[PDB]
């Protein structure tokens, strides 16, 4: 019992817990599992379902574990016959008005109500009266409603208020006819809307895209990561046969607590549409079916003409570390350094890791006292990250934004909308500057928009001036963070997928362009007489402008490495097999390397991973975020002349995400995302 | 966490009384008599995470759970559709064996089994689950605390107004 | 005997794609996949039974909550090729239509016992 | 057209403009309708049957639906809200597809 820890007795066994735990927390620590319906770790305590009732010797009547504070020397009985009888009675009251909809309920194999009925309930009923009836209302394109099945927990309301922050759902009514939902006809607007479906214990809120399509026992679950954004949300992809049926989050307190954004949750629909299955080589009749050998022969004849920087590579949002290291090694062997990323921040320095990663971990942002957001709309860029910023706002942190006025869930101080306001703030003329200086844990978050700006160098220099003046980086706390909107950006910077000195010094019109999943390239990137090789898994703007199309696997079909905005290296698994005559991307690049006459050393996936470990040691540490030495100041001292060379632009710091639901090829193919976009635009 | 106090008692006791003789890694795989290309397959040793739909902790590695929860799983291979009836066809002999039957109490047990058969394995530890509520809603009392909007300002009082 | 999917007297199929009969099938002879229909009903886009894998236990008739699947009174269903013994939703519905009255009488009699 | 249309629900037991839960069956073959996937003929579909049946007036704000006339020879007992229902917009039994509507909420 060191200081804060106390001792409690649960079923006659000693458990040492902190003072701030409740009875349910100590019972979980004791290995006893209490029946719960409305209690949730990350939501406010409610106490309404009354299924957690246990016995305290001191208390005369049973108490709710979730809301009862534990005390020193408290004895907790969870197996007394009175508790068993109370559990059975509460279960009866829960089931008397429940609809007999188990065969038609999509929660059939995954219902808490059924399982706790079997375990903690009687096998028979005594209710013969009329049950209650509710009329369902539309909550949007993604949420299906069966309010008759609704047990009046408050998880959806508590989530919509505390976490999502749209505050749309509430319990309207009194007594038995009390109902949950918007009183008006309203559609749930948050991009975290899908989480209420998982939070709903009794299937009253269900997924409309995943409606009547499968049962839980039929699905094989593979634990992988979400490439929708640079958060790298941990997910579980459920598959029947060769089809992905649904995507649900996984617990990782480091990155995604247990929440998933709507785009990641519902973009699996676009994984069945506009798919590339076979190699395509262009002719007078257009792109046509070809074998792998013929496409490689055409690529060989094309590369033979080009030389040096005439070969150009553009990596996409969804390219993985292994394919990028493969393409990098192949094009350096050919003799090219024209390796750029599609985003538009191609020339961003990869020299020091602290410059382009979130040095404060996502988890450690909880301890922030004052937060500054520069040129970022964290809602669109990463909804779960905005949820965590909402959590820190709830604690009492003061948040300032130096970009455009956006509808963040929390309230914030609008410091300014243009670069000059950040310039003034860095110089030290600001009340928010005196708040940043005063705070013990100051955090500055710079968005990806600043990175994709023609004047990124001096804006970053101003941000570094603010870092040094306000001391956000100190011993034991690094408060400089850069949030990324793409998964492949941090990995590309880490491996060194940056234009070489010659490419920047002497721009050369590209004669052959290799697109590694890049469907968002700027049109000036390809000289319009170049020979374009598109490697990817959906047909989009990239494939249309390709002389040769090489099919590749998707994130659900390959075991690949991605780096987070915090730089934590995470890996995908093969949930479903590869479609048609498509191959893993690194294998495609290595086969092309053999064909063209520059054979690459690696011939297996572990060898590729070893090459990644050589280029960047942290890639060996999968699942662990590696700290960055604070070298950002020496870098800006190094680039003195260049930052002076950088000019001023007539643009205001704002997000580059026009529409959140469609940002990549998979989302653009998705029908569900299109319906969401149409609903928002009406 | 206390004790199952059932047949599992004698099960564990049979475990601790008895032991297995040490052999070189991979030697037993030859005794097994299965095709040797089976051991060319790679192994992932993991514990399933909790399903987001349900709030039960049985499937997780929790002191409540008394069942084996560490699986040996093999990598997924090609699957196709029957031309006549659209059924899912496969050629993988080890498709469902690991998920269905290869359950182990501890990671070292599965690692020992894999090394005994000669399977190369990568062990993935589950993401730690800590049942710690946030400071804003640490308890039920915190819901109705002054933290919501601050201490009530008393400048509205008639004495203070006048 | 021979399996048959049944319809309501209105002509609407009784099946609600609970998929319990596929879970209870000892031989794994039933494969079911479903969707939401345009009206909004939970209906199957596929219901095929392998009669070369069926053991005619009748468990699927026991598990169905809406009496959609029944084993009819017909034992004359030999075929000259195995492909004709792989039934599908249309064939099962036709078999239910052909034997509707007999199945209904048998079910009315059987309801008293269970 | 159907190849680029968003799957939608007519709205008999759903709403006029909702998404339709869809699997990927028939996506390669080119079929995008529920009945096309499983029926290859040109006959009348069961949905055509259920549409032909007309909504039935009832008294009260709740109707007990057993699917068939005998409770133990049809769908499980269901209680359907008749509030805000009319002949044009009737309530539906999810098991059977029968349509109901009542005028009682209008104080009649």
């Amino acid at each position: 019992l060191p200081a804060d820890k106390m001792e409690v007795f649960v079923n006659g066994e000693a458990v040492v817990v902190p003072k701030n735990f409740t009875v349910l927390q100590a019972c979980d620590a004791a290995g006893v599992d209490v029946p719960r319906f409305c209690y949730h770790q990350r939501l406010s305590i409610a106490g309404n379902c009354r299924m957690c009732l246990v016995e305290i010797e001191k208390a005369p009547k049973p108490v709710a574990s979730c809301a009862f504070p534990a005390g020193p020397g408290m004895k907790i009985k969870t197996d007394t016959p009175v508790i068993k009888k109370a559990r059975e009675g509460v279960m009866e009251f829960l089931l008397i008005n429940h609809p007999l909809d188990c065969p038609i309920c999509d929660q059939g194999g995954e219902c808490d109500l059924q399982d706790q009925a079997m375990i903690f309930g009687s096998d028979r009923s005594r209710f013969i009266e009329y049950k209650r009836a509710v009329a369902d209302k539309n909550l949007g394109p993604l949420i299906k409603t069966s309010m008759n099945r609704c047990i009046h927990c408050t998880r959806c309301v508590r989530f919509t208020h505390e976490v999502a922050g749209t505050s749309e759902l509430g319990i309207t009514g009194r007594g038995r006819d009390s109902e949950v939902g918007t009183y008006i006809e309203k559609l749930h607007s948050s991009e975290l809307s899908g989480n209420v479906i998982d939070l709903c214990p009794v299937g009253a809120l269900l997924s409309k895209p995943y409606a009547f399509t499968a049962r839980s026992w039929e699905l094989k679950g593979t634990e992988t990561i979400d490439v929708s954004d640079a958060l790298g949300s941990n997910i579980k992809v459920d598959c029947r046969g060769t089809e992905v049926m649904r995507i649900t989050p996984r617990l990782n307190d480091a990155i995604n607590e247990e929440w998933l954004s709507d785009k990641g949750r519902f973009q699996y629909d676009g994984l069945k549409r506009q798919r590339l299955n076979t190699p395509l080589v262009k002719g007078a009749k257009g792109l046509e079916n070809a074998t792998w050998s013929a496409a490689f022969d055409a690529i060989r004849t094309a590369i033979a003409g080009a030389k040096g920087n005439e070969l150009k590579a553009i990596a996409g949002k969804l390219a993985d570390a292994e394919s990028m290291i493969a393409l990098k090694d192949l094009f350096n062997k050919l003799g090219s350094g024209n390796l750029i990323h599609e985003d538009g921040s191609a020339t961003l320095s990869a020299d020091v890791r602290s410059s382009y990663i979130a040095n404060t971990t996502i988890a450690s942002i909880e301890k922030a006292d004052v937060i500054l957001l520069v040129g970022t709309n964290p809602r669109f860029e990463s909804p779960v990250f905005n949820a965590r910023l909402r959590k820190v706002f709830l604690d009492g942190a003061k948040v300032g934004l130096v970009g455009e006025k956006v509808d963040l869930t929390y309230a914030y101080q609008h410091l300014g909308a243009d670069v000059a306001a950040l310039e003034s703030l860095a110089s030290g003329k600001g009340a928010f500057f005196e708040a940043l200086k005063g705070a013990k844990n100051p955090v500055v978050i710079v968005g990806s928009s600043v990175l994709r700006r023609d004047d990124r160098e001096a804006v970053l220099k101003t941000v570094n001036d603010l870092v040094d003046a306000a001391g956000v980086v100190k011993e034991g706390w690094n408060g400089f963070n850069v949030l990324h909107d793409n998964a492949s950006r941090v990995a590309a910077l880490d491996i060194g997928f940056v234009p070489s000195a010659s490419a920047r010094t002497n721009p050369v019109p590209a004669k052959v362009v290799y697109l590694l999943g890049s469907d968002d390239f700027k049109d000036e990137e390809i000289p319009a007489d170049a020979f374009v090789i598109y490697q990817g898994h959906h047909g989009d703007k990239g494939a249309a402008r390709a002389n040769v199309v090489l099919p590749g696997a998707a994130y659900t079909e390959k075991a690949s490495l991605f780096a987070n905005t915090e730089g934590r290296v995470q890996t995908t698994r093969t949930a479903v097999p590869v479609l048609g005559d498509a191959r893993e991307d690194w294998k495609i690049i290595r086969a092309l390397s053999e064909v063209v006459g520059q054979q690459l050393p690696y011939d297996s996936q572990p060898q590729v991973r070893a090459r990644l470990a050589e280029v960047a040691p942290h890639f060996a540490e999968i699942g662990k975020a590696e700290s960055a030495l604070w070298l950002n100041g020496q870098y800006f001292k190094g680039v003195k002349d260049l930052v002076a060379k950088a000019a001023r632009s007539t643009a205001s710091l704002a997000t580059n995400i026009s529409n959140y639901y469609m940002t990549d090829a998979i989302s653009r193919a998705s029908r569900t995302m299109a319906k969401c976009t149409a609903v928002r635009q009406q | 966490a206390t004790a199952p106090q059932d047949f599992s008692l004698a099960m564990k006791k049979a475990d601790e009384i008895y032991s297995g003789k040490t052999v070189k890694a991979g030697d037993i795989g030859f005794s097994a008599g299965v095709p040797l290309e089976t051991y060319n397959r790679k192994v992932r040793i993991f514990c399933p995470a909790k399903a987001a739909s349900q709030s039960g902790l049985g499937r997780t590695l929790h002191p409540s759970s008394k069942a084996p929860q560490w699986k040996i799983v093999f990598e997924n291979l090609s699957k196709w559709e029957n031309p006549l009836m659209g059924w899912t066809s496969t050629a993988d002999p080890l498709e469902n064996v690991g998920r269905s039957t290869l359950l182990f109490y501890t990671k070292e047990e599965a690692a020992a089994f894999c090394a005994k058969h000669g399977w190369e394995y990568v062990v993935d530890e589950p993401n730690p689950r800590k049942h710690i509520r946030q400071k804003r809603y640490l308890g039920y009392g915190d819901n109705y605390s002054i933290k919501r909007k601050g201490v009530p300002d008393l400048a509205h009082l008639p004495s203070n107004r006048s | 005997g021979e399996h048959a999917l049944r319809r309501y007297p209105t002509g609407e199929e009784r099946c609600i794609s609970c998929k319990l009969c596929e879970a209870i099938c000892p031989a794994q002879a039933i494969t079911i996949e479903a969707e939401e229909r345009e009206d909004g009903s939970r209906k199957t886009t596929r219901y095929d039974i392998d009669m070369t894998k069926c053991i005619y236990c009748g468990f699927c008739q026991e598990a169905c909550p809406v009496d959609a699947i029944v084993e009819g009174p017909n034992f004359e269903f030999s075929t000259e090729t195995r492909e004709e013994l792989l039934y599908d939703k249309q064939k099962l519905l036709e078999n239910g239509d052909k034997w509707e009255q007999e199945i209904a009488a048998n079910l009315r009699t059987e309801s008293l016992y269970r | 057209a159907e190849k680029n249309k968003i799957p939608e629900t007519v709205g008999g037991a759903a709403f006029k403009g909702d998404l339709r839960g869809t699997s990927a069956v028939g996506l390669g073959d080119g079929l995008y309708s529920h009945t096309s996937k499983w029926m290859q003929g040109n006959g009348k579909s069961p949905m055509d049957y259920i549409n032909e049946v007309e909504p039935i007036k009832v008294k009260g704000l709740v109707v007990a639906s057993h699917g068939s006339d005998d409770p133990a020879l049809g769908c499980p007992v269901e209680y359907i809200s008749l509030k805000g229902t009319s002949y044009e917009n009737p309530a539906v039994c999810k098991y059977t597809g029968n349509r109901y509507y009542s005028d009682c909420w209008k104080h009649g």
């Binding site: 069945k272 798919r275 | - | 004709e84 | -």
Partner: peptide
């Protein structure tokens, strides 16, 4: 020779039970 599966050669509209739609290249 009345009933055959929908994937049969005899079936008027033979079915390849592919669950993914494939991109069609632009003309010319």
């Amino acid at each position: 020779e009345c009933y055959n599966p929908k994937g049969s050669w005899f079936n008027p509209a033979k079915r390849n039970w592919k669950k993914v739609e494939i991109w069609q290249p632009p003309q010319v």
